[PDB]
Structures are given as C-alpha cells and as structure tokens.
C-alpha cells in the first residue's frame, strides 16, 4: 500500500529484491488485487482494450509513414520484378566504411533495409500509387489512435462508467457483432474494391476529390434493383490483360472465373469483391437470430436446456452451462483463443497456395517469412487456450451448479482419455522412429533398394478427386463424365482445372513416399502436445498424489520432499512442459515446408524425393548444404550484406545456450553464492560506505523456470528466422 506494488500489500511488505520481480510479473492479474470487485475488473478490462487498439493503430501508422518517407514505392510500382523494396534507412555511428558501402542497396543514397514483410504488394494491390496516399493514411491512423485513447479515458470516468449487467448482455452483443462488426465491414470493403481497387487496376485514378463524378459500371444501379444481376458479369477481363494499365480490359465487376491471373499469378479482384459481397449478405441475414428488446428472437439458455438426449446417455445434457459460461471470463478467453488459433493456422495454410497479392508468388523470401510467422503465432495461441482452460477449471468451476452435465462427466473419466492419448502417441512415435532408422541403416550399408517406402494412397486419391490427373485415378472431377463435373463445368471448372494442373504454382503439389513420414511425425507432435495440455487441464482440481490442489492455486513451486518428492506438480508446470513440444512440432512443420519449397524453386525436385526418406538426408542436404552462404557473412578476407544475419545467428545460438543455466541449475547453490558475496561486500573498505536498500536474494523456482523458457524461445526464434531469411535471400530461388 506504500511501496511500488500499490495493488498488493503482501508484495510491498517484504524487503528482498523479489518484490520488484513479482510486482512487474503480476501487474495485469486484476483478480488478485486487494479490494477488487466485479465492476472494477470489467472496467479495467475495457480500458485495457482501448489502450491496445490505440497501440495497434499507432504501429500501423508508423509503418506506413516510414515506408512513405524512406522507401522507393514510386520506383517499385513501375518495375515490380526488378526492384527490391526498402523498409527504412539505417543510421549508425558504429558502422565502418565497408559496412556503409555494402548495405547501400536499391536506388537509395545510403544504407537501407530490404522489407520482407510484404506490405508493398498489399498496398499496390489495394490501389495506392504515390506517396501522398501513404502520408494521408499515416495521418488517418494517427487520428484513429488519438480518438481510441480519448474514448478509453472518457469511459474510465465516473459519469460514463458502465455497469456489470451491461457487460453480461450476451444476445445483444452477439447480434451487433454478427450484423455490424462483420457484415457491414465486409460490405464496405466490397464497396472499396468496386470503387477504387478495380478501376485503379485498369488505369483509372479514383480518389476522394472525384469519386462522385465517375461510374463504376456504365449501367449503374439499374441492374441491381431491377433483378438482372448478370449484367454485372458480361465482359470479363481478357487473358492478355496487363496489371495497372488499360490494355485488354473489361467492364465486369463481379465474376466467378476462378484460377489465377495469368501475368501476376494471383486471384482476380472481381472474385474477391464477389466473395466479400456474398459473405456480407450471409452475415447480415444470420445476425438476427437472438432475442432483444423487440419481443422476437432466440434465447440462448432455452436453446441449451432443450438439448438433452432421452435415454440419459449424456446425463443432464447442457443444463446449467449458460450461467457457467457467462459468470466466468476464462471460459470465454479459452474459446476465443482456440478459435483464433484455428483461424490463424487456416490463414497460414491458405495464403501460400492461393495468393491474393500482385507479384507476390515471385518473392520467395516474403512467402517463407509470412508462413513461418503465422504458424508460430498460431502455435502460441493454441497453447494459451489450454492454459486458460486449466485456469478456469482451477478458479471458476462450481461443482454443485454443474451436477451431471457434460463438464462433470468429463471430470469423471479423465483416465480413459489420458490412456488413449498416451497409446496413440506411443504408437506413432515408435513406428515413425523405427521406419526412419531402418531406412537410415539401409542407406548406410550401401543398399538403397531394401528401403521401406509407403505411398500416401489416400492423399493422392484426394488430389485426384479434386481434379488432378498426375496419378491415374479417375474419380469425380477427374472423370470426364460425372454429376459433379457436369454441374460445375459451366461456371468455375475451366479456370480451376487449368490452375491446379500446372507445375509452376504451389496449388496441390505432388507428394510421394517422403511426405508420409513427415505427416506422421506432425501427427505425433500434435498428439503429444495435446496429451500434455489435456492432462494438465484435467488434473488441475486434484489427483491421488495431492487431492487438494485447488487450495494452493494455479501456480505454486512444489509440495516438499515428502511422499517421494513432488516437483512440477502444478498445471503451470504442465504448460511449461508443453511449450517445448509446441516449439518442436512447429519447427518440424516449418523445416518440411522450407525444404520442399526450396527444392521446388531451385529447379530439381528429385533431391528432396531422394533425400527426405532418411535423417542423414535432412542433416546433410538441408542444413549443412544451405548454411554455406549464411556462415560466410563476414570472414578475415572481408564482408558483405549478409553480415547482420550471421551476427543474429550467433546471437540466437548464445541466448539458446544461456537458457540452459536456468533450466538445469537450481536455487540453493546460487543462494549460498549470494550469501558469500554479501559478506564480501560488507567486509571491504572504501566500499562499505555504500549500502543496499533491498537485500539481494536468488530467484524463486517458478521465476527461474519462466526465465529459462523465455531464453529458450527467444534463441529458437531468432536463430531460425536468421537462417531462413539469409538462406532464401542468398540465391533468390
């Protein structure tokens, strides 16, 4: 109440140095603050949301302004395939003359940084052609950040403070989010695509000054209200159209052509506009489901209570789930995080096979970086979902009010789920490792023909069903005569089949015996991570070794050396163990993607197909072969533009190796060392005039585990990012 941690007196009373650490650690945990209530917690959450929105808007404004000021957008838009984008300028007093000479890239007059984020292509596609547009966007986003901060401060005031009953109005929030946040935004983006992006792609410059004097379609709004909507698709863009000019163009604004643009190998803008229009219509129609003040609609609690199967195979069914979900925030956070993780993984998997930006398929480094970034974010989010589920089970679960519903039945039979997850993980790991080792030994002895190679029959059948004729099966779309082929032939199949049956693109790549083992390894990683997280979540309330785990809290060090010793027994430790497996699985996935695509780009796909079946192939033909240019960033003879990537490589190695300190060595040794150091400082002359205010103590156990995990993650991420970017940029292919 007096020291720095004003939100907790217990953290302010103690005189050691752990007060600072734990004050910084638990600043955002609004439930543990003293004299807290529901209203204060909800209002603080609202204010934090507003602050976060302001931060995001400021970030994007800064990006836009820096690209506008120190970039070469105007020179890039003319020659997209022969100009390297510039992120921002470099000013550094520590730079030597060769460093200044080597880093001067592009058309600039000094050192710059090549942008691998890929914002240039996005801004070019959405219809920006000069730096004035970028400056205007920067000013607009600055204004948005300012108004967000102002709104947050206004809603923290006593007069405009909402009440708890307002926050729990679920039906109104769902209706407004499904109708206003989603549908209306998609409709407005469709309007932008029709009004600015599509005409800007045909050479017509539409801006704020003169967007009222131009007609997006010569007919106007007549066809839309008459009923002859087909007039909006009469004249599609010709197959010889050139992006950004008025040669071989059309007048349609809504089509269903499918496939890719011939020149840019990207999706047509008309298809995107049509998709957004349809999605907006669907959301607007679907947003009127729930009851509100007007006396019609649906009630969620009655929907849940009515779904109970006769015969009692599910018990009480869904009775009492509404109040359980509403009264607890961790349930909502877990659901939102799981959905966001699945959506992020979908985005990562889709944006590389069906690119939507002009001249992005020809930029390999951008694609690789975006895929890796989104996959890592998805993994972290998916881990957080289970962490918050476990927190909910610890804190907000009331056993009496959820009697015999689905949650109680889940807590009843955790043993079967855990056992079956363990069996599946053991099976997959055993057999995948066995096959890999057998292939490796067979290659080692010099006889490759004794290998075990299994064709992925089911996936190839799926690809043949989609319309690929590279295997031999004739099913569904592959067959010339079929109900599906006939039904869909008149609209989108002519473009889709041509797009899928080419060899340059990444749409449904050919797969062989090498992909089978990698897919099984990915499945093994998913199963093991799920096992760890599910065990941690289900065994949070109690077990046989400690049947009162809910009293100690979510995170606590241990329970002493008795009963055989109980280390890492809490759910926090289960999450801390599952983070490693998440990192390992994501690393496997990224390695597979990077190697497959680099072998495809370099020209020959036989190298992967012949060296991916044994582990020495991965170790020799992927890492060792591709590190040659990366490790040569600086040498005794000189240096080149790849020096910073090698430096960050070594930096990541050092941080990853430093993590082992905190992950292996434990507290007592360091506490004794601090004892001795304190004596030494107190007993020396000319230095005892200075005295400490906080008694130095060694770090706690959970804090040390967290620090070690953070070091591990930082080193992992930095090392892989450096390797990927340097290796893909060295050859540009």
């Amino acid at each position: 109440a007096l020291r720095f941690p004003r939100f907790s007196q217990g953290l302010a009373q103690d005189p050691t140095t752990r007060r600072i650490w734990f004050g910084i650690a638990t600043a955002h945990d609004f439930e543990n603050h003293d004299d807290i209530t529901e209203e204060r917690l909800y209002q603080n959450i609202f204010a934090s949301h507003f602050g976060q929105l302001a931060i995001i808007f400021l970030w994007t404004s800064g990006n836009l302004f820096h690209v506008a000021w120190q970039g070469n957008f105007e020179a890039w838009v003319q020659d997209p395939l022969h100009v390297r984008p510039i992120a921002h300028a470099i000013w550094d007093p520590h730079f030597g003359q060769p460093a200044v000479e080597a880093f001067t890239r592009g058309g600039a007059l000094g050192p710059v940084n090549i942008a691998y984020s890929g914002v240039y292509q996005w801004w070019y596609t959405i219809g920006l052609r000069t730096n004035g547009d970028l400056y205007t966007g920067a000013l607009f986003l600055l204004f948005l950040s300012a108004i967000s901060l102002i709104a947050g401060w206004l809603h923290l005031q006593p007069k405009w403070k909402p009440s708890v009953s307002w926050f729990k109005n679920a039906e109104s929030r769902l209706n407004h989010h499904l109708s206003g946040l989603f549908g209306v935004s998609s409709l407005a983006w469709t309007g932008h695509l029709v009004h600015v992006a599509i005409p800007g792609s045909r050479g017509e410059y539409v801006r704020w000054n003169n967007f009222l004097g131009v007609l997006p379609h010569p007919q106007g709004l007549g066809p839309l209200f008459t009923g002859q909507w087909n007039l909006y698709a009469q004249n599609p863009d010709s197959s010889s159209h050139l992006f950004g000019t008025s040669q071989g163009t059309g007048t349609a604004i809504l089509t269903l052509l499918g496939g890719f643009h011939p020149q840019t190998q990207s999706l047509w803008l008309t298809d995107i506009a049509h998709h957004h229009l349809a999605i907006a219509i669907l959301f607007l129609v679907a947003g009127h489901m729930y009851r509100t003040n007007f006396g019609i609609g649906h009630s969620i609690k009655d929907l849940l209570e009515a779904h109970i199967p006769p015969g009692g195979r599910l018990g009480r069914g869904h009775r009492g789930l509404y109040d359980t979900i509403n009264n607890s925030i961790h349930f909502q956070l877990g659901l939102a995080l799981a959905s966001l993780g699945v959506i992020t993984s979908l985005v990562a998997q889709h944006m590389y096979s069906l690119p939507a930006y002009a001249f992005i398929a020809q930029d390999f480094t951008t694609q690789a970086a975006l895929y890796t970034h989104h996959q890592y974010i998805a993994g972290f989010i998916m881990t957080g979902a289970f962490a918050h589920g476990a927190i909910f089970f610890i804190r907000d679960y009331n056993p009496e009010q959820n009697e015999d519903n689905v949650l109680a039945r889940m807590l009843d039979h955790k043993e079967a789920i855990i056992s079956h997850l363990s069996w599946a993980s053991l099976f997959l790991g055993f057999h995948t490792l066995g096959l890999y080792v057998h292939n490796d030994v067979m290659l080692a002895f010099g006889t490759p023909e004794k290998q075990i190679l299994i064709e992925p029959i089911f996936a190839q059948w799926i690809q043949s069903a989609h319309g690929k004729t590279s295997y031999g099966f004739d099913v569904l779309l592959s067959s010339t005569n079929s109900p599906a082929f006939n039904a869909g032939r008149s609209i989108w199949l002519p473009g889709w089949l041509n797009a899928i049956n080419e060899n340059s693109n990444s749409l449904f790549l050919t797969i062989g015996p090498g992909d089978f083992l990698v897919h099984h390894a990915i499945a093994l990683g998913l199963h093991t991570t799920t096992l760890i997280l599910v065990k941690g979540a289900l065994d949070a309330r109690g077990s046989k070794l400690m049947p009162d785990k809910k009293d100690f809290g979510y995170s606590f060090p241990c329970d002493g050396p008795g009963r055989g010793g109980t280390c890492d027994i809490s759910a926090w430790d289960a999450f801390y163990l599952a983070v490693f497996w998440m990192l390992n699985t994501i690393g496997w996935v990224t390695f597979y993607w990077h190697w497959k695509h680099i072998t495809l780009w370099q020209g020959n796909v036989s190298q992967f197909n012949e060296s991916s079946t044994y582990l020495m192939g991965w170790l020799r033909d992927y890492l060792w072969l591709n590190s040659s240019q990366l490790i040569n960033g600086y040498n005794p003879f000189g240096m080149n533009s790849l020096s910073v990537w090698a430096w960050m490589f070594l930096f990541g190695h050092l941080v990853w190796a430093t993590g082992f300190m905190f992950l292996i060595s434990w507290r007592g040794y360091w506490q004794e060392l601090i004892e001795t150091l304190a004596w030494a400082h107190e007993r020396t002359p000319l230095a005892n005039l200075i005295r400490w205010r906080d008694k130095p103590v060694a770090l706690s156990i959970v804090q040390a585990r967290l620090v070690g995990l953070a070091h591990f993650s930082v080193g992992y991420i930095f090392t892989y990012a450096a390797f990927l970017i340097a290796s893909t940029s060295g050859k540009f292919g």
Binding site: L2, R3, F4, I20
Partner: peptide
C-alpha cells in the same frame, strides 16, 4: 534534413536515461 543524426541519440541514450532514473526513484520511494 539530417533528422536521424538528431533523433537517434535522443531515443537511444537520453530518453532511456531519464526513464531509468525516474523508474528507480519511483521504485525506491517510500
């Protein structure tokens, strides 16, 4: 122009020094 030559030292050195001094004073203050 030469804006970086003025702005980089400010963000790099002066502002972190002010922030560290203020934060240490606020941490140790009773």
């Amino acid at each position: 122009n030469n804006l970086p030559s003025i702005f980089v030292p400010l963000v790099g050195l002066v502002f972190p020094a002010i922030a560290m001094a203020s934060l240490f004073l606020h941490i140790q203050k009773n």
